[PDB]
Design a protein around this ligand. Structure first.
Ligand SMILES: *C[C@H](O)[C@H](O)[C@H](O)COP(=O)(O)O
Ligand SMILES: *C[C@H](O)[C@H](O)[C@H](O)COP(=O)(O)O
Ligand SMILES: *C[C@H](O)[C@H](O)[C@H](O)COP(=O)(O)O
Ligand SMILES: [Mn+2]
Ligand SMILES: [Mn+2]
Ligand SMILES: [Mn+2]
Lengths: 305, 307, 307
């Protein structure tokens, strides 16, 4: 019911939706906040979904327009413009659209536009969450509020390892958001395969996920689901190594007063140089791994109409 | 919505059609809340209390994957017998127990949800979940508070369960715009005790005023529920110093043993019963009857205005 | 479609809304609670005049004899100003009870947003919003204003959050809940009495036209919630940084020492600060309200041009 000036759904996605084919949304923030590994790794993510028997929709703001599904040139535009592209959460969305700017959507904002377009399934690396020190700083991702209110299943590696996972798990419960371990009781640690922390429920198949999605929304329980999909054991980072870098990066952000939306990008960029780019490599792989699972979920859900 | 998902018993259906006042009840107090037989038999007696007050009880649970509004004696026994084998079900758990054809005992959050689906506006319980002790560090905060923020049901209780942090819970309710009504009390009752150092948001002396405020609240578009805090009858109340000791010890022990999540409340209540030689349980039972009685009057007074 | 028993809009305001004239809502808490008599009613009446001089139509909002009123006479304004703290301070949680019992009440930002939204008014001018209190990471004291800004579609023009609060935590809280914090011609978040602070707004916008356009896009895109427009106090009416801060710090330590909590906090703090500053903080407060009313009117005119 929304104006075409505000929101444009691409021909392929529009068609995939027309023909009731499985569609999987993707976020644009990851691919702004590292060229060339930026625009390239995004192109392959889509192909990964295409080879799975599903349809990719990468989501972004371009020229003040909310776009569902992008083109190679658009992807390239976002990858090269880099940090010069505004990072867009819920509170940012109206201003980029109004001012006709380009923007890269976080999980919260990608969920929003996905929902507007009727897409129930969304794949990313990791969700935002409660940051370390949040009991003091109140720094808590808008992603969690979006998850609370907006009906979309986000497939991820868990919360980004840079966050406070224990606080995050409590937060999700409080707000009624299912945290689903895929073939795991233990909450996947992003880079690491497990955590000291447990998911809310373990489900062993995409079909069981899709079936729960259907029940959830048919019962009117609005809000999304977190599917925590652990990283392949071969692409995992060694615990002491990944966590030593993270701990140091976190501590450096404090000394330097990094706050607000810049925190996550700063932390990940630091951790990436502190591991010599090994953390990035793992980040790329979990993305692929999530896009595959996301594709299965999407088709099962399509089956279940 | 689908009868595959949600089923209302004939007794409850007849009540809603004929506009007789209905009082919802939770099932988590039947399985995880107390022990057998004290669970099943008490649950049955609660229903009878409501009936004797001239209202219609609807106990809510998930049976074989079905959200049920109103339960047979058989079903109540099942939940009571199965006990801790039954999944404790809050908002986040609900979709999975239904999908997998399982049994579940519903918390305040879950019961509110199902009640609302049924058009039941009044719900009696022992005490609500809340902000936990230490939550400024742990973020352990019941999904009950978020349900009260967003779902239109009046929940009649003895306040929040006193194993929790009452001060933080009263701030939280305020922030989320939930009325905390003292029934014939300004002091917030604290479960087993009549008083606490804390206040409700408003004192009201009659079921009639409460029902009037419900109609006004919801006709003005202010979605969310209401907490009615109802002090335990004097004869069943527990001495402050005695119950507060047992609670402090149970809490300190939960933390030493690394108890967390949904297991916290059941663990704490069970330990308090131990430490009080079963007395806290006896009080928990009496406060539930008391709330069922008040809830019945509120439902009567609400139904009188509503339809 | 709200019952006329609950909600009454003044003939002028209703005429303006029908004819698509720009309307600015005003709160009543600043009248009864935020400021002393006579300076409170005097201020409130002259605010309405200010809005009129800017080509818009003021609507002061309060609860009068149990009725939510949009637009008030000067007597009603003066009644609220004279009765003072005898008038109930009404947030979201209080609203149903004052309306139900037929009482008078002065609306905070939260309940004013609610009533404005019911009347279809998109722009609301106030002094400063509630927010996260100092020590809230411990106390959980967090204004219901923030939750209302999260879920209700009204642009609130203020001088920031009142600086008696914890501004850093408030900025974090607003982001989590998806609420734009707009600097009018400023990068730094102004703090009430003070033009700047250590904190930044979410976005800087230099014209009322830009704010109006963002509002249309936000709401046409289905992103429910309000917007904070933080408008710095004009430099000549500003408090000296060192002086106002010593006053606030002391008032805050005193409120804590005296065990002042809950809804009495903000009015206690502002009164104490006025005492400590010799009425100077009040003078700044009155001027920033005028200045916000001016900007609010421009925003309303622009929005009306778009919508
Ligand atoms: C990493 C993923 O894009 C996630 O949504 C963002 O990092 C969230 O960032 P913030 O909005 O919580 O800062
Ligand atoms: C006691 C009552 O059923 C209440 O809803 C539960 O204790 C809440 O438990 P939790 O969901 O907060 O763990
Ligand atoms: C000052 C402004 O009216 C603000 O809304 C109130 O002071 C908020 O008061 P509280 O609800 O946070 O106590
Ligand atoms: Mn943040
Ligand atoms: Mn908990
Ligand atoms: Mn407060």
């Amino acid at each position: 019911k929304i104006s075409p000036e505000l929101l444009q759904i691409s021909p392929e996605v529009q068609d995939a939706l027309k023909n009731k084919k499985p569609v999987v949304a993707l976020e644009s923030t990851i691919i702004s906040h590292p060229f060339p590994q930026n625009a390239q790794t995004a192109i392959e993510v889509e192909e990964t979904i295409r080879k799975q028997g599903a349809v990719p929709a990468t989501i972004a703001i371009i020229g003040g327009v909310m776009k569902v599904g992008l083109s190679k040139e658009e992807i390239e535009l976002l990858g090269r413009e880099g940090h010069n592209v505004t990072k867009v959460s819920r509170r940012d969305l109206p201003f980029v659209v109004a001012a006709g700017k380009n923007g890269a959507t976080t999980v919260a904002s990608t969920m929003i536009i996905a929902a507007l377009a009727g897409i129930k399934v969304f794949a990313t690396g990791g969700i935002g969450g409660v940051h370390r020190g949040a009991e003091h700083t109140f720094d808590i991702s808008a992603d969690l509020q979006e998850l609370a209110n907006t009906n979309v299943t986000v497939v991820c590696a868990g919360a980004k390892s840079i966050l406070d996972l224990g606080l995050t798990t409590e937060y999700l419960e409080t707000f009624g958001v299912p945290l689903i371990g895929y073939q795991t009781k233990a909450l996947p640690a992003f880079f690491c395969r497990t955590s000291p922390f447990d998911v809310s429920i373990r489900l062993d198949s995409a079909s069981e996920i899709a079936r729960a999605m259907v029940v959830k929304w048919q019962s009117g329980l609005n809000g999304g689901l977190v599917v925590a999909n652990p990283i392949p054991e071969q692409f995992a980072m060694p615990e002491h190594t990944i966590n030593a870098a993270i701990d140091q990066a976190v501590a450096e952000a404090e000394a330097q007063g990094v706050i607000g939306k810049e925190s996550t990008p700063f932390l990940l960029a630091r951790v990436a140089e502190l591991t010599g780019g090994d953390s990035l490599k793992s980040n790329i792989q979990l993305v692929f791994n999530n896009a595959i699972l996301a594709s299965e979920i999407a088709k099962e859900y399509q089956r279940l109409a």
